[PDB]
Amino acid sequence: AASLVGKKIVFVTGNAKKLEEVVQILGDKFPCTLVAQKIDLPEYQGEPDEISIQKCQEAVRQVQGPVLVEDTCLCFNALGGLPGPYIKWFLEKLKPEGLHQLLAGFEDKSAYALCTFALSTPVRLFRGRTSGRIVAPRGCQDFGWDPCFQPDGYEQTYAEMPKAEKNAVSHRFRALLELQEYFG
Amino acid sequence: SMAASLVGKKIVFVTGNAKKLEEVVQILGDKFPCTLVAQKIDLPEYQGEPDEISIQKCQEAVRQVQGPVLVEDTCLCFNALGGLPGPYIKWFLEKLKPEGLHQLLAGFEDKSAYALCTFALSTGDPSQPVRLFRGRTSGRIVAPRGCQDFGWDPCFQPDGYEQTYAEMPKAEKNAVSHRFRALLELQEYFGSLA
Numbered sequence: 001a002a003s004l005v006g007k008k009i010v011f012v013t014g015n016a017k018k019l020e021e022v023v024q025i026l027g028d029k030f031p032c033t034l035v036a037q038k039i040d041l042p043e044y045q046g047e048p049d050e051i052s053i054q055k056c057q058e059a060v061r062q063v064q065g066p067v068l069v070e071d072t073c074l075c076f077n078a079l080g081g082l083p084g085p086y087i088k089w090f091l092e093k094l095k096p097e098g099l100h101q102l103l104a105g106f107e108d109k110s111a112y113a114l115c116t117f118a119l120s121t122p123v124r125l126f127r128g129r130t131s132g133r134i135v136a137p138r139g140c141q142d143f144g145w146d147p148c149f150q151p152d153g154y155e156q157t158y159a160e161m162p163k164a165e166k167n168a169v170s171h172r173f174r175a176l177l178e179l180q181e182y183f184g
Numbered sequence: 185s186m187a188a189s190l191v192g193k194k195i196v197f198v199t200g201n202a203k204k205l206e207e208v209v210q211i212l213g214d215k216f217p218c219t220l221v222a223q224k225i226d227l228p229e230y231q232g233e234p235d236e237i238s239i240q241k242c243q244e245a246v247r248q249v250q251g252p253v254l255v256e257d258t259c260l261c262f263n264a265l266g267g268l269p270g271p272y273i274k275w276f277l278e279k280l281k282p283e284g285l286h287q288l289l290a291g292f293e294d295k296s297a298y299a300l301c302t303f304a305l306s307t308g309d310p311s312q313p314v315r316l317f318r319g320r321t322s323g324r325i326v327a328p329r330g331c332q333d334f335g336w337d338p339c340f341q342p343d344g345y346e347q348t349y350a351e352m353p354k355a356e357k358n359a360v361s362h363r364f365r366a367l368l369e370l371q372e373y374f375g376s377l378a
């Protein structure tokens with residue numbers, strides 16, 4: 001915790017859009033300095049905690065310096081929290097349009113979006129979560145499942161929202177707030 | 185090649201799934217030139233393609249057991265969903281049950297599906313390669329029929345048959361299953377020899 005002050009932290013992720021968000025959802029005065037190195041890291045099957053812990057332990061082996069990773073899950077309550085940690089693949093095969101069709105046989109259109117950051121130099125996690133409902137796609141297409149996730153309290157999806165608004169209310173925000181709050 | 189090295193020897197089928205073991209032992213009769221010893225370890229599986237998952241699972245089994253080793257992974261793949269849930273079928277069965285796995289295709293017209301079963305065999309030496317053996321049955325996902333004995337069987341009706349895996353007597357399932365097709369490749373491999 002205190003050890004990482006003013007240090008360099010290699011943030012490892014291939015995803016340009018999430019990195020771009022993570023830079024923006026903080027700034028001066030985040031104590032450390034981040035450095036993006038794109039590496040396509042291989043994730044395990046199971047629970048987001050276990051996955052994130054292991055994903056981080058994998059990054060440690062390859063970078064060896066101080067390191068940070070993250071995982072995002074889109075979890076449908078109708079489907080016991082699935083696709084959850086496998087969302088990436090469902091998005092690859094179905095796209096947002098299809099993700100809505102996936103719940104066509106269920107009344108419960110509700111869901112939640114989970115974001116789990118993992119840190120190393122004993123691994124520590126920082127979790128953020130937003131509840132909502134899965135709808136027919138509305139808005140821009142340039143970032144994953146945003147078009148079909150309508151968060152609770154709002155009449156527009158994450159894709160429709162101006163990035164500024166999303167960055168204030170999102171699952172990522174919730175997690176990043178833990179990360180920042182941990183230092184000071 | 186490794187066929188020669190493993191013939192007559194002990195191979196450890198490392199799996200946590202007993203029903204799956206029960207079917208392997210009833211498919212391979214007294215007709216197998218090697219001896220199977222089940223050892224229950226529940227192994228972690230990577231995300232990705234079926235082959236690379238199988239390979240890696242084996243290599244993990246190799247680390248924990250040290251002798252010759254056999255592992256396997258089963259997939260249930262819906263064509264409407266581009267081969268999903270596929271290798272992550274466990275977790276969908278676990279949450280949705282067969283009734284739910286049907287409902288999953290409710291808004292999709294295409295009910296066609298296939299089950300893929302991959303076996304992965306290693307000698308024990310981690311440096312030389314893992315040999316793979318697939319089999320795949322085709323069918324469609326239907327409203328659950330039969331009896332909840334084994335996993336997703338009630339909702340899978342194979343092509344050319346009018347009843348589901350669960351409705352079939354276990355003897356008929358073992359004559360036509362994805363796992364039978366894969367163990368055929370394993371028995372093809374051995375029995376190229378004498």
Ligand SMILES: O=P(O)(O)OP(=O)(O)OP(=O)(O)OC[C@H]1O[C@@H](n2cnc3c(O)ncnc32)[C@H](O)[C@@H]1O
Nearest residue numbers: 012013014015070071072087088091143144145146
């Ligand atoms: O580079 P890494 O860090 O490994 O990230 P990834 O691309 O593999 O992505 P994940 O493992 O976190 O899986 C989440 C999927 O959901 C998408 N995603 C993640 N966060 C999102 C957000 O806030 N809004 C929309 N889509 C998001 C992203 O495109 C991925 O396909």
Ligand SMILES: O=P(O)(O)OP(=O)(O)OP(=O)(O)OC[C@H]1O[C@@H](n2cnc3c(O)ncnc32)[C@H](O)[C@@H]1O
Nearest residue numbers: 199200201226227257258273274277334335336337
């Ligand atoms: O991998 P191991 O350690 O052997 O045990 P497992 O239960 O994790 O096995 P899988 O990875 O193949 O998971 C596939 C899921 O589908 C089920 N399954 C596997 N073969 C099946 C079959 O032939 N008929 C019905 N269900 C099956 C099984 O119970 C799992 O829930």
Ligand SMILES: [Mg+2]
Nearest residue numbers: 043070071088
């Ligand atoms: Mg990822």
Ligand SMILES: [Mg+2]
Nearest residue numbers: 227229257274
């Ligand atoms: Mg398994």
